């Protein structure tokens, strides 16, 4: 894969907007939406909230896990534990990029949410290169990754698997 398709899979998460136009139910091949009552919340998939925000037709809302207090506890829980701890949403990096870039003025304290998210990320990446070094160092044959999201996997996967194949080969070249 590549980041630009993880970003595609991440635009299926649901968010809540507040439209300012009138429209009746829409029957999408992936569900139903609406109705859109001006000045009333409604829950849509991201790829539509962003596209409506760019055309000046809505007003986003911060997801509940995107609070500057619960995050300041996740950031500590992550540094205490010594394994991959569970995360608010399986796609938090892409949410807190797309949202904070496109709707940073409808989110209070954007430039602290952003730094806490980055602090969590910079740790969950450090635990990986330790869990991906003991693997080689001790020549394991299995490794249980607990709560890795698809993005951390995809940033260093096409190197790790490709450097473990060359190790299986070198380790089983004497049998015949």
């Amino acid at each position: 894969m590549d980041a630009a398709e993880v970003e595609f899979l991440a635009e299926k998460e649901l968010v809540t907007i507040i439209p300012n136009f009138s429209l009746d139910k829409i029957y999408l091949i992936g569900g139903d939406l609406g109705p859109f009552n001006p000045g009333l919340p409604v829950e849509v998939p991201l790829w539509l909230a962003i596209n409506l925000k760019q055309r000046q037709k809505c007003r986003l809302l911060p997801p509940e896990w995107m609070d500057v207090e619960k995050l300041e506890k996740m950031r500590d829980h992550e540094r205490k534990e010594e394994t991959f701890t569970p995360m608010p949403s399986p796609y938090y990096m892409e949410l807190t990029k797309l949202l904070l870039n496109h709707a940073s003025d409808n989110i209070p304290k954007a430039d602290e949410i952003r730094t806490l998210v980055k602090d969590m990320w910079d740790t969950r990446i450090a635990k990986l290169r330790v869990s991906a070094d003991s693997f080689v160092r001790q020549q394991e044959a299995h490794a249980k990754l607990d709560n890795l999201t698809l993005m951390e996997i995809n940033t260093s996967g096409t190197f790790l698997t490709q450097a473990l194949n060359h190790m299986y080969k070198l380790r089983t070249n004497l049998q015949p």
Binding site: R55, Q56, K109, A110, D111
Partner: protein, 538 residues
């Protein structure tokens, strides 16, 4: 015709069509486009953007596209001349004009089918009434009265089309439209502010009108940016903020040093007379009266010590009363993006205006236009930050020309108007070869001159300037600027003079641009033209 309301007459017609946008080349028109773009990319309206530069290229462009499309939009071009003939269109084609030039041509106003005008009629317009300009012995007895009518027409024309000026900028009409639809943002407000500031920078509007428009725009700025009353601590630092500033008139002083921006603003380079060693010490005394070390003033402004810059913008306004410079603070706006991004609305202008008019040419006429249209969106801060090193290089190569024609006295008093000319051998004179970057040099030359000369007559005569255009065709370019003063109405009158002079002498001339006061003339018809012009203006 005149469009009464922009929603239901201009927008909601082209909302479902495929329009074609012709664009002139000036910061005002760039900023008037970049809003219409963002208003089309929001409603999925297929447009097309053709950058034109004269009348020949506008005609060439209309030649090719005139059968696919049948809607059109002209931006800062084609409101001071007649349109239904230079293009010779069909009947079912529609034209919208959103130009600033004045006065609007006559027929373009009594043609309510093909040429609609997006011009707010509450400007300074006084268009003559309809039949005053448009259509047995008793036969002759009444056709003599019709001859009287024609004679009155020949006069009222000369009354109405004698002075050219500019109205409210396009980037403010478009912004009114974009606010009606309720789809305005900060990014569409910064382009309004820049498209307004540019006119006042190039000195095409009066200070009264400029302050009136600033008074208008400040309500919008406060409506947007005040909603963050006390939450300015929990708003993202990486989100643009526009603010009203009462700030200095020095050009580019926040990127240049404080010293190289006093020697180059063509408002303190005139008063201080920073071209004559006798008055260069005036600058020294001005600096010494404030306690600014001569070693901090020479260093870049971002690196100056923090203890000096506390009340700089006040200790400069004060110590400029003691020298005869009381108009030193102006009213502008400024933008912050992030951690280190802080622009005044007259730095964006001097950078854009010099990305579009770079001397070294690298292709067709529409290769620089694109690179300057690029540097207005925040995703391209690497062009802006680059177009600020051209705007510097230009400003340091203008005070080294106004220093030539004032330590050599190349301003001839040819009678009713001053006169000058340039030499190729002087360095940095091929930079001003373009017929657009020559008006600013002349308009600063007049400001330095009027302050320099000791006469009382020359201080109130308009200037006329010529500099060589093409060595092969052997031709020069000529401009004409109104008589300078503090409260000049800014109503130039040379578009008629040059026309009638070339008509009298019957020489070769080209009125290629959209403004009339810029002409290309054979190097040999110079005097043949000039003498007849001297006699004509009288």
């Amino acid at each position: 015709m005149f469009v009464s309301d922009f929603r239901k007459e201009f927008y909601e017609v082209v909302q479902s069509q495929r329009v074609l946008l012709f664009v002139a080349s000036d910061v005002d028109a760039l900023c008037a486009c970049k809003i219409l773009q963002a208003l089309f990319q929001c409603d999925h309206v297929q447009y097309t953007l053709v950058p034109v530069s004269g009348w020949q290229e506008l005609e060439t462009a209309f030649l090719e596209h005139k059968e696919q499309f049948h809607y059109f939009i002209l931006i800062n071009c084609g409101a001071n001349v007649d349109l239904l003939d230079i293009l010779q269109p069909d009947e079912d084609t529609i034209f919208f004009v959103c130009d600033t030039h004045r006065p609007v041509n006559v027929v373009n106003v009594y043609n309510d089918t093909q040429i609609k005008l997006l011009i707010k009629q509450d400007d300074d317009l006084e268009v003559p009434a309809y039949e005053d300009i448009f259509r047995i012995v008793e036969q002759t007895m009444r056709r003599r009265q019709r001859r009287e009518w024609e004679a009155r027409r020949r006069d009222i024309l000369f009354d109405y089309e004698q002075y050219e000026y500019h109205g409210t900028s396009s980037a403010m009409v478009m912004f009114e439209l974009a606010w009606m639809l309720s789809k305005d943002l900060n990014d569409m407000l910064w382009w309004a502010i820049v498209g307004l500031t540019d006119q006042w920078v190039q000195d095409k509007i009066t200070q009264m009108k400029y302050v009136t428009d600033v008074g208008v725009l400040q309500r919008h700025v406060s409506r947007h940016n005040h909603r963050n009353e006390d939450e300015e601590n929990t708003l993202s630092v990486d989100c643009t903020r526009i603010s009203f500033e009462y700030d200095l008139r020095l050009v580019l002083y926040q990127h240049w040093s404080l010293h190289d921006s006093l020697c180059n603003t063509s408002y303190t380079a005139a008063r201080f007379k920073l071209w004559s060693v006798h008055g260069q010490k005036r600058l020294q005394e001005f600096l010494a009266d404030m306690g600014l070390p001569l070693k901090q003033v020479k260093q870049k402004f971002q690196a100056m010590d923090i203890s000096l810059k506390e009340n700089l913008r006040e200790m400069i306004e004060q110590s400029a009363n003691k020298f005869g410079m009381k108009d030193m603070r102006v009213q502008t706006f400024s933008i912050h993006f992030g951690f280190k991004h802080k622009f005044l609305a007259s730095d964006v202008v001097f950078a854009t205006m010099s990305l579009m008019e770079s001397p070294e040419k690298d292709g067709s006429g529409t290769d620089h236009f694109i690179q300057a249209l690029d540097s207005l969106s925040r995703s391209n801060l690497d062009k802006l930050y680059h177009g600020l090193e051209l705007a510097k290089k230009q400003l340091r190569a203008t005070q080294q020309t106004i220093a030539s024609c004032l330590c050599t006295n190349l301003v001839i008093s040819q009678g009713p108007f001053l006169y000058c000319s340039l030499m190729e051998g002087t360095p940095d004179v091929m930079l001003f070869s373009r017929p657009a970057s020559l008006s600013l040099l002349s308009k600063h030359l007049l400001k330095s001159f009027v302050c320099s000369t000791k006469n009382r007559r020359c201080k109130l005569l308009p200037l006329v300037m010529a500099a060589p255009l093409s060595m092969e065709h052997g031709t020069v370019t000529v401009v004409g600027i109104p008589p300078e003063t503090d409260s000049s109405d800014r109503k130039n009158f040379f578009g008629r003079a040059f026309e009638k002079a070339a008509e009298s002498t019957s020489s070769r001339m080209l009125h290629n641009h959209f403004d009339l006061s810029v002409i290309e003339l054979k190097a040999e018809d110079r005097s043949k033209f000039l003498d007849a012009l001297i006699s004509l203006l009288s």
